[PDB]
C-alpha cells in the first residue's frame, strides 16, 4: 500500500524467573525499529549502550540516582510482585491434551491437541518397543489462545497383528496418556 | 429519543464513599475555553492537541482533546474551532490538562448576541427553580451547556458539596423536538471517583441547536 516511511519505537521490560522466584532477573530494553539501542540488566546494575545509538541515553540515565534505585528494586517491586499475582493462573495453568492417532493422509500420525503449558514428551512404540527411527515432528505449534498443538507421525510399513502406541507425558497428567492403535 | 430513566438506573450519592470535591472541581469555575484555535499536534489518532495559552492562573498550557474515534479527530483537525469543556489533570497523559469533545467549528457557528437556554430544575418532582444559561453559538455541545447548568447549581443549589451532595440521585436531560437525552449527574458507587472515565461521556462531541434545546434537571433529595 503506502511507502511513506514508518518509525517504530519498541520497549520491553522483562522478568526472567528461575525455579519460581528464587532467581529473578530484570531487563529494561529499548528498541528503534528492530534495533535494541540501550538496556538495563539487573545482574549488571547500570545501563549499557547496546549500540552507539544508546550511548547518550545510557550516560544520562545512569547519572540519575532516583531512577537507578528504582530499576534496581524492580526485581522485587515489579518482577516478584507480578509473579505472585499471576502465578495463580499462568504458571499453574494446566489443560490436558486430546491425543489422536490416525493412518495417514504410509504414516501413522499422532496428534496431541489443545494442551497447555509447553512441556510435552511424545513417543511412538512398535509392538511395545520404542521407535526413535523415522519420526518427523512438527515442532510445537502455538495457537495464540493459551493452547498448544503438535503432530508427531511414525514413518512405517505396518504389518498385521502389531500394536502401535503413542505415549504422551504432560504436567497436567498424573499418569502418562496412551493411545494404542494396532492395525 | 433515548428512554427516560427509571429510579434504579441512576446512581445514588449516598453510595459514593469518596470525597465529593472531585466532582465539584469538574464543574465550578475552572474549565477549558478557547475561541478561534487550531490543532497543533496529536498524541493518538483519536485525539487533537491544542496550545491553549492561559494567564488567569495558568494551571496548564497544552490541552489534549480526545474523541470517540478517528473520524471526529479528522473532522476538526486542521480547522479553527471553539473549544470548551470540563478538564482534568489527574491522569492526563500525552506527548498539562485533558478533556473530551468540546470542540466546535468556529466560522459561521456565531452570532453577535447571546441566546438564552431555559433551565427548569425539578427537586423531587417539584419545579422550585428556573433559570437561563447563555451561549453565542448556533450549535453548542451538550457539554458546554451541561457545565454551565451544573456550575450554576453548585453555587446556588449546593449540587456538589465537599463531602457528598445534599441530593441522593440527579440527572440532566436535554430536549430538542424529537430527540431528548440525559446524563447521570452523580458519581458511581465506590471508594473512588475516576474523573477521566466520567468525563469520557462527552467524547462523542454531542451538539445541539442553541435555538431549540431546552434543559431539564431532575433531583431527588436524600430523604
Amino acid at each position: 500500500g503506502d511507502t511513506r516511511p514508518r518509525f517504530l519505537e519498541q520497549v520491553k521490560h522483562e522478568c526472567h524467573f528461575f525455579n519460581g522466584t528464587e532467581r529473578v532477573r530484570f531487563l529494561d530494553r529499548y528498541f528503534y525499529h528492530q534495533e535494541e539501542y540501550v538496556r538495563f540488566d539487573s545482574d549488571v546494575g547500570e545501563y549499557r549502550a547496546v549500540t552507539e545509538l544508546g550511548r547518550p541515553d545510557a550516560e544520562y540515565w545512569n547519572s540519575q540516582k532516583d531512577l537507578l534505585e528504582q530499576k534496581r528494586a524492580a526485581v522485587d517491586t515489579y518482577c516478584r510482585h507480578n509473579y505472585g499475582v499471576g502465578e495463580s493462573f499462568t504458571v499453574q495453568r494446566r489443560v490436558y491434551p486430546e491425543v489422536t492417532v490416525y493412518p495417514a493422509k504410509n504414516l501413522l500420525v499422532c496428534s496431541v491437541n489443545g494442551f497447555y503449558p509447553g512441556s510435552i514428551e511424545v513417543r511412538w512404540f512398535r509392538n511395545g518397543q520404542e521407535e526413535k527411527t523415522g519420526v518427523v515432528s512438527t515442532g510445537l505449534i502455538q495457537n495464540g489462545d493459551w493452547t498448544f498443538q503438535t503432530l508427531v507421525m511414525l514413518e512405517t510399513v505396518p504389518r498385521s497383528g502389531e500394536v502401535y502406541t503413542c505415549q504422551v507425558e504432560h504436567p497436567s497428567l498424573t499418569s502418562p496418556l496412551t493411545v494404542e492403535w494396532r492395525a | 429519543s433515548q428512554p427516560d430513566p427509571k429510579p434504579d438506573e441512576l446512581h445514588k450519592s449516598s453510595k459514593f464513599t469518596g470525597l465529593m470535591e472531585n466532582m465539584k472541581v469538574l464543574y465550578d469555575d475552572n474549565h477549558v475555553s478557547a475561541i478561534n484555535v487550531k490543532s497543533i499536534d496529536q498524541f493518538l489518532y483519536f485525539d487533537l492537541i491544542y496550545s491553549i495559552k492561559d494567564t488567569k492562573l495558568g494551571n496548564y498550557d497544552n490541552v489534549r482533546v480526545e474523541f470517540k474515534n478517528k473520524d471526529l479527530a479528522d473532522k476538526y483537525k486542521d480547522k479553527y474551532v471553539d473549544v470548551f469543556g470540563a478538564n482534568y489533570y489527574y491522569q492526563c497523559y500525552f506527548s498539562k490538562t485533558c478533556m473530551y469533545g468540546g470542540v466546535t467549528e468556529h466560522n459561521g457557528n456565531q452570532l453577535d448576541k447571546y441566546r438564552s437556554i431555559t433551565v427548569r430544575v425539578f427537586e423531587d418532582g417539584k419545579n422550585l427553580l428556573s433559570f437561563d444559561v447563555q451561549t453565542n453559538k448556533k450549535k453548542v455541545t451538550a457539554q458546554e451547556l451541561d457545565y454551565l447548568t451544573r456550575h450554576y447549581l453548585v453555587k446556588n443549589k449546593k449540587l456538589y458539596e465537599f463531602n457528598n451532595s445534599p441530593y441522593e440521585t440527579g440527572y440532566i436531560k436535554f430536549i430538542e423536538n424529537e430527540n431528548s437525552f440525559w446524563y447521570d449527574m452523580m458519581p458511581a458507587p465506590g471508594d473512588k471517583f475516576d474523573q477521566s472515565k466520567y468525563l469520557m461521556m462527552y467524547n462523542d462531541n454531542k451538539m445541539v441547536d442553541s435555538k431549540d434545546v431546552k434543559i431539564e434537571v431532575y433531583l431527588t433529595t436524600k430523604k
Binding site: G1, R6, L53, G86, N113 | F43, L44, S196
Partner: protein, 179 residues
C-alpha cells in the same frame, strides 16, 4: 523451566498508534485499549483473579512517543525496513466432516505492526464469527498475529486468508480446503 513475563509496548509514527500488553511465555495475558482506557484480558477468566490500572499505561506510551522523536532524529530519519509476513493456515485440530473446528491464520515474523486481514469462504468475505489478537512481540523484535475462523468442514467449502502488508508487493492468499 525458565518462566518470563514481559511488558511490551510500542509507538508507531506516522500512524500515531501504539500498543501496551503483558506477555507470559509468549502468550498474551492482556493488552490495553487506549481509546477506552480499559484492560482487555486475553481470557475472560483472567480478570477474575487479577486487575491492572489500565490508564497508567498511557504514561508509558506518551514517553515512548517522546523518545521516538528523539530517536528518529539521532539516526537522521532512517525509516524502518519492511519485512513481509510468513502466513500459515492450519486447523485448530484434526479435521472431520460435519465436525466443528476452527481455522487459524498465523501471521508471523513481520514489521511494522500494521496489517489488513480478511477471511474468504468461497471467494467472498466473512465478517462474522471471527476474532483476532493484537500484535504479539517476537524474540527477534518482529511480530506475529492470530486471526481465527470457527467453521464446519465440508468438501463444499473452500477458504482463503487474505493479508495485506507493505512488505508485500501484492495481497497474499493462503488457501485451505478439504481434499
Amino acid at each position: 523451566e525458565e518462566h518470563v513475563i514481559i511488558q511490551a509496548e510500542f509507538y508507531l509514527n506516522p500512524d500515531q498508534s501504539g500498543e501496551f500488553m503483558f506477555d507470559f511465555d509468549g502468550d498474551e495475558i492482556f493488552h490495553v485499549d487506549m481509546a477506552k482506557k480499559e484492560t482487555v484480558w486475553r481470557l475472560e477468566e483472567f480478570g477474575r483473579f487479577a486487575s491492572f490500572e489500565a490508564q497508567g499505561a498511557l504514561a508509558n506510551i506518551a514517553v515512548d512517543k517522546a523518545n521516538l522523536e528523539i530517536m528518529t532524529k539521532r539516526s537522521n530519519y532512517t525509516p524502518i525496513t519492511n519485512v513481509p509476513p510468513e502466513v500459515t493456515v492450519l486447523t485448530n485440530s484434526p479435521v472431520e466432516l460435519r465436525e466443528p473446528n476452527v481455522l487459524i491464520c498465523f501471521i508471523d515474523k513481520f514489521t511494522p505492526p500494521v496489517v489488513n486481514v480478511t477471511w474468504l469462504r468461497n471467494g467472498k468475505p466473512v465478517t462474522t464469527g471471527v476474532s483476532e489478537t493484537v500484535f504479539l512481540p517476537r524474540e527477534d523484535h518482529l511480530f506475529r498475529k492470530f486471526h481465527y475462523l470457527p467453521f464446519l468442514p465440508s468438501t463444499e467449502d473452500v477458504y482463503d486468508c487474505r493479508v495485506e502488508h507493505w512488505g508485500l508487493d501484492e495481497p497474499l492468499l493462503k488457501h485451505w480446503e478439504f481434499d
